[PDB]
Amino acid sequence: GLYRKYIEYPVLQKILIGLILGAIVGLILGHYGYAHAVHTYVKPFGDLFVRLLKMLVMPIVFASLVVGAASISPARLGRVGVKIVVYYLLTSAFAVTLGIIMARLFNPGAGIHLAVGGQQFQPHQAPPLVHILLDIVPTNPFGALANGQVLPTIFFAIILGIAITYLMNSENEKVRKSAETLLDAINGLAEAMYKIVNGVMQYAPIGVFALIAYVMAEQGVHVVGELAKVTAAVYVGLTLQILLVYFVLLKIYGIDPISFIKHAKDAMLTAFVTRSSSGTLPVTMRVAKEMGISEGIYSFTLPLGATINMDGTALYQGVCTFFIANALGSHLTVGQQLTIVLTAVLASIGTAGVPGAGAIMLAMVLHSVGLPLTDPNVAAAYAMILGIDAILDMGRTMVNVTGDLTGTAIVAKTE
Template sequence: MGLTTKIVLAMLLGIVVGVLFNFFETSQVLGAGITGFINNYLTEGLFDIIGRIFIASLKLMVVPLVLVSLICGACALSEGSRVGVLAGKTLALYLLTTAAAISLALMLALVFQPGVGMEGVQAAVAFEPKPSPSLSQVLVDIFPSNPVDAMAKGNMLQIIVFALLMGYAIARCGEPGRRMASFFNDLNEVIMRMVGVLMVFAPYGVFALLATKISQLGTEAIFQLGKYFLVVLLALALHGLGVYSLLLKLFSGLSPLELLKKMRPAMVFAFSTSSSAATIPVTLSTVEKRLGVDNKVAAFTVPLGATVNMDGTAIMQGVATAFIAQMYGIDIGLSGYLTVILTATLASIGTAGVPGVGLIMLAMVLQQVGLPLEGIAIVMGVDRLLDMVRTVVNITGDSVVTTIVAKSEGYFSKEVYYDGNYDSVASSADGNNSAAERTSG
């Protein structure tokens, strides 16, 4: 049985076990003693420990993987002065997809109006949002004053800037630079092998995570906020399957179905961890080995996307903003919704790829249009489950943009993408063009 099949089976089994545990707890059909044993020793005990260890192991790989991969990629690209062009394409596509995501979310929220009829709902849980940074502070915080501190805190944007600067400098240092480049390339191979070792234990981690999370979630909150929940899911599905497929076909001519099929392992990880950052090792490995993207491009675009490209989070912010406005009977008008689009798009740049951070950034969006922050407490009930789904959309967007950019720059293998199942003449022509582009680059 392949690793992907094992992970999918572990995910399904985890969901089934989580639903059963939640049913036993709410219905008390097994008695208080057995239910207490399940909660104390399985859900909050063994499964929780295994899940947290697995997440910690994934996060262990994130900083060294991003740092070393980006240094290698920036060094290789800087030799041909392509890093500026690649960065421009990547950022433009990420911002385009985020703006499209928030626009789609607002449109669906205005059509289905999930907040209408809930004007009398009171938040059962008080929500005290952390102070949200200003957009100017977000831009300033991109640049590190202490790279060691940035690595210790896992500040991905600062790590990315430092790695790009170091890679560019290594490419311009002659013989010392070549020795350093060789060292980082070897280190990159070692880190990728560590990722491979970790993947052996992935099915167990995925099972434990989902069994714990589904058991704790329950279904009551989903029924109470069913319309909001379904509108967010619809927006995520349309964006993840429709918008991304259209962009991939339009800008690269590649088959979207092939990409979606090969990204399944990364999607499963994203769903179970609810963290774009923790999924970076799996996303990076998948786009290189299964989609045929060269490490020079993937090492730059994937870590950047996990920090900047938060389309799923932007969708949640758009629907939640309209939902809260409708629930409180506040009309923010066209200018207000345009402000939401702009703010959510820019806020996604400063949104860390960790679970639950979207709610903090939602507070920033609500402040910009004068909506009450208390409304966040109402959507918190179903946000954990939606967080799992929108993380899948986030990493799918990362892979789509990475593939588009790699193909446009000539750092892409069509043979790997289609597993060799495409016209041999087209393959030869594509290979010759790719080789010529790499030589000229």
């Protein structure tokens, strides 16, 4: 009876209920020193939810890209790829520019209270751009599906789908039956993955409550004081990023942004809580399929953009760079923010397949200015920033996924 009442209750209402009571119970138990208790008792439910959403990432990206490449190969896919790459670079530049502006409006960093403490161990720089651009072609397709590797799986699935499309028009009548068997089996795998992510989103409110309860419990207390200016600057920059870039881009290309948010509420909240833009790829592809977009556009612009397009990470990089520059008391050489913008774009395009990309992206952005992370002062101020990393990480993951959904909708409306 009560289980039937819980299932038949709508999903977005209980997601909001879990979010609100998670924030309340998290701040209350963080205010009273019960951090280790909630960390050992409640956080495993959120870890289970994150692992349940990371389970479906690789089969859905393989299967509904093999069946997603049943579109016209020289006309559609090339134009969609070049348009979505141009879009991703443009919005990353706009996002880091707006982050620089939002950090220049506030004054984050006044007091000098830095002890040396624990410093960063010279964070290892990115591999050369040739090696990362050669990472896209896989040496083994099963070895690319076996551990991560979203970009080699994208490449292999695209090539297999184009080959199957060329295969099903052959003059033979056995090769046609073989290819129409393989395509139907892979399509069945994709539809099974969507039917699973329906039930995972049915489970989602418990994990949302647990995750944001732990986040607002451990790092919900350390946010008051000087770091509140950093949190306010990042969050105001992210909401102004949405309302002044994505709304303008949807009003230019003639789709209602309110109906767009009414659709993408699911993936936006799941990416806000889950704190991993690659771990909400099944929810993003589900909400793109329910938005009325053909497979050959969303199925390629979403898993590509979950690895390249990081807008909220770029805005946090700009705000963190300006906070490090104010902590040491530098003028920061007005006109050299073009180097910050350029390196924030080139770091996103040149750290595609590398795991742990955000840390070395922030490292090379700080290194291009003149504050390398081997200095003890910048390491102390960055360690002071890192205590509230999750509170900024939630919002920047939400904007990182909303960017992908907006770009997919723009390219699909254009084509």
